[model samples]
Target chain A: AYPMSIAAQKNDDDRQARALAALAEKPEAIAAKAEVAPAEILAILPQGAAVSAPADRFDAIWNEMRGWGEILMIVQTGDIVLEVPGHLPEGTESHGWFNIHGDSPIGGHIKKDNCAAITFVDRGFHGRRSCSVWFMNAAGGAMFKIFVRRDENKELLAGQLAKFEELRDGFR
Target chain B: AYPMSIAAQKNDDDRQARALAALAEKPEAIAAKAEVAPAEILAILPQGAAVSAPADRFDAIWNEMRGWGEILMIVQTGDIVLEVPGHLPEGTESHGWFNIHGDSPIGGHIKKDNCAAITFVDRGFHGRRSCSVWFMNAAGGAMFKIFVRRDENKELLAGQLAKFEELRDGFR
Candidate 1:
């Protein structure tokens, strides 16, 4: 039997939203406990035109992520974030390559030659930080987003972002 | 700003549920057009004791999934089955190694030293078929499950399952 019913899953979603709302009110306090400096965290994020490459450039990139990798959350153009719990191979970065598909998170994919832009938020509505890469191609225009939840410390997440930036170029 | 509002996302969820329920009713017509034979599909699925081996036994398995493959779906005891959209490397089965984590689909990992049974179902409730790998350990007991929706043709999916199974023991 499917262990968690739809109703139960809905309840979990509500709780997560409420929790994010609460955390959003305390950004500094949340930052105060961080072991790594926020500036250092900011430094590693990917930037500029390279990330906005056409969709076909990412075809091979997407191919690289064929089977394994973590997709913490996905926030589409008109949908609330759908959180995922799958694992990724060692040293893989979510920012560089996202496992987008019509049957996976949000039931859609980032199309070829359509990656438009990447955005960053220090503190989003959820009170956590995030990075969103915009896509606009045959797959539809959407955002492949990743979040740094309150549960993750600043330093560790920065390392992830940095790794992601470094790997972005490798996709080319 | 995040592209979607909570209210809009909720509406989409409602629509998705109604849609899935509708598809669950007519499976035979859906099955008749299957491009792959059921027996061939069955041959590729993971089997025997190794799949149920201690969770740590998969540590090496995880290493194998690094940089390649796809995860069709995962079902857990307390959660709805998680279906993935990433593709796998050529000639790999979906059953070999699943990328389980704390947040993707199943809530958490299969604990160390804990071995749970793996089960399979054909033409199940949602007009789909599935493979369920039950789990237990310090993380609490759960099931890691997978499925092939009615809309997916059997031949293509069978190839996937076979590829998954072939890769499973390769980790040994």
Candidate 2:
């Protein structure tokens, strides 16, 4: 329940004043933030010493990003699991529970985030929904989050929740 | 600071009046309908995959964002070190810093960000300004927003600040 800004173009003045006043003195609440894993970082970097940029369009630009400094990959996924390291613990598990504070499709999920439905994808199983892995502390605090989709369309990779235990552990 | 709605547009006097009334009852704070990441999920996906629909292009529809979503990013010349697995207790150095968020350009050197000026840049050095993350937690959060630059305008990639690390490492 975070309130940002407001702009109501009304002919009246008094009404507008009251609306703005309520916004400033908003209340506080708890929320979760996703943190990625370390192995995932290695997947994004160059192969040997450094992978040179392709000859095509963004080649030079992409190459330069590496030069900007030692490149780091925060979120990484492997055969079965996605790892997120060194982040606050997730407090709870719920669907659509993330917010990058940007204007992306997933943003909607973050805003409407609630813990009522705990959806899970099982190993050797699949679905159309986006698969999310959450990291939480013993108290169920969610700090770091990761979403795995079949591709960039943002579809969740699915299986039953119980499969996580059946599958072999991925590289940590 | 600014509270408004973009989903519903009013033209007739009655509609406008009612809309204004709703505005009067509007919550003091406005949060994005959801949360989104800075780069389109596709931005990190395979390049030029027609991942963007006509309405999804950064230019085509980003400006339409309203409510609690805001966007920002930064570029740097130094490397980002990450805490990786298989490393010693003190072996937290990697080519990448926290990858979930972008590097800090402005938030790096200013007293506000705690990164010193002289330590700004050099081999294995970091003097960032801002992190590449966004937030809608504070007052006046917008529902939607976009921050982008053209490939022809590489200058825009110069020193910038974003919310990646700040939000990821909140109070930690």
Candidate 3:
């Protein structure tokens, strides 16, 4: 059995909340100290990348990729798109990578350095909930890969692709 | 010009570590087949919710908090500690609360159901540095809370005042 009553727990919660309210002002202070400017972020991005869609539109998808998952092809069925900061494990140049995942049997990763265009064609395997991420390799060959089997949504996928395309053009 | 060199940035300066060893298994296959037993975690903890100091001691103060920050005195220091589960806003628990920050001041948050005992003493705020977490409320008169802060030596805080203590002791 729990020792503290709900009331007691709530009081502690409120206390912690109040303290947090006070500390909330720190990030901005840190940001001020942060020598890196918002423009600096662009310095790391692929040259000439532009925003094709509203930034907030892909926020949900970006948050989702932070969790555990797999890799897949670009053109599968299902939904959800996400763009993540790309760091070559070794390269000095900074760029972006887009990952798509969902109920489909496909998933994929895209590099902004060489991205050209994206479109959905009538292609994918028939399955329970197929999803994948598809992207063109430097050789101009389609790399269709399977990631994890999970649920997904269309609105998120649309947002993800739109933003991804915007950035792809920007990189050009 | 930035203060650091590219080589330094490649090291801890960029805050990213890299390795080129081959992992035999892919991410999806690994997640699809994870099978660790819960009992294995229990083996590391102390028996109950009492501080058996030497159980789980970290090598450095920085090692203590994995995410976020804040600080305070057991009595009046204002700070915050937040542990977010890393998910989207649409999920039912959807929402966020912010906190403050500082150098002499530190703050953080732990999941309530997952928190244990806290202690502090003169040993910290001195040498290489030391830290711990504690709480207070009504026992009747003022709780002269003296949760000890000393040299912790294990990977986790030991004897996590068990109940939820089970989770604590197990963290050992």
Candidate 4:
């Protein structure tokens, strides 16, 4: 019976997904044409681009995120998604990139020129609310997304959340 | 190239769905143990049951929802999920049920006894913020979800949103 329910759930999920995809017409059509960047998508969708910043300020914006406490950083490449929940490393600008190298599991260098837009997404997913900063690339893709961390109780970190709003308002 | 992108998107969405399912452990295990109602699930998850109501007051609480403008109503049974974006039917209670036969696409008879709880979920999904009211069943399930409306600009209808908050506070 357990296996049966799992199978049924899988089928149901597939159906739900299909219907969701069906309901999305504008985005699907645009994606059919050419590579569409996440930022660009938000620019078109109502309330999506309501809060955003220019790519040029990406470094300063990122710097402001420091000391906000632990966060959830999501990186997606191809079909792979890496989710690491921890503190963001301190950073300094390198040759055309914002570089962060520390003795931690999370560290990377972001190429400066490729960043086209920065968007603040305060949205709900599957009924859970989250606030995130999306670094979108000129190549029409997300460089990465940094989300406010939630405590063990699943409540969003209030300090980080306030900082997110602060940064968003500053950029807007 | 278009077809390739389309197929790749489907594959990617499937992977995302699979990974999401994989990340959910406690809920999956609990759902497997017994018929788990949506309300019961919220009770277990730290922030899930943030605001909820007993089954007995289901009708009175629902009456509070009247006059809220166009809303999104979602109903799921088996593998089928139906989404209707419109106003809810005004209802009156009969023996053991709440009936609304108003002339609209939204109308039905809700078995009063089966409604175990009404939960107000103020959460985010996919970076879009939405507020909704969930009606859960005694049999460990959700009967339906009514979401506050968003205008063409995709902003949550503020007036109705206030009412949802008001109702949630009342129940609390």
The candidate scoring highest on TM-score is 4
Clashes of each: 27, 79, 50, 12
Tens digit per residue, CA lDDT, model 4, A16-135 = 555445435532312432333444445544464337788778768767876677777665432123354556677677566666655433555566666777878776544677688887
Question: By lDDT, is 1 or 3 better?
Answer: 1
Top of the candidates by DockQ? 1
Better of 1 and 4 by lDDT: 4
Q: Report the CAPRI category for model 4.
A: incorrect
In the range B86-117, model 1's lDDT, one tens digit per residue, is 42222222333232333234222232233332
TM-score of chain A of 3: 0.24
Report the alpha-carbon TM-score of model 4 versus the true structure.
0.40
A128-150: candidate 3 lDDT, tens digit per residue: 32232223233333222222333
Which candidate ranks first by lDDT, i.e. highest?
A: 4
What does the lDDT read for residue A167 in candidate 2?
23
- Scored by CA lDDT, what does every candidate get? 0.37, 0.23, 0.27, 0.63
Sliding window of 10 residues with minimal summed lDDT for model 2 chain A: A26-35
> In candidate 1 chain B, what residue range of length 10 has the lowest lDDT sum?
B73-82
DockQ of each: 0.08, 0.02, 0.01, 0.01
**Candidate 2 residue lDDT tens string, A1-172:** 5543444334224443443443243220011011222222212222321112121312222232222222112221110011222222212224533322221111121212322221111222222322233332223232223333332454332332223222212211
Off by over 4 Å in 1: A1-105, A108-172, B1-51, B64-68, B73-82, B87-129, B132-140, B143-152, B165-172
**Model 3 chain B, poorest ten-residue lDDT window?**
B76-85
Model 3 TM-score relative to the real fold = 0.19
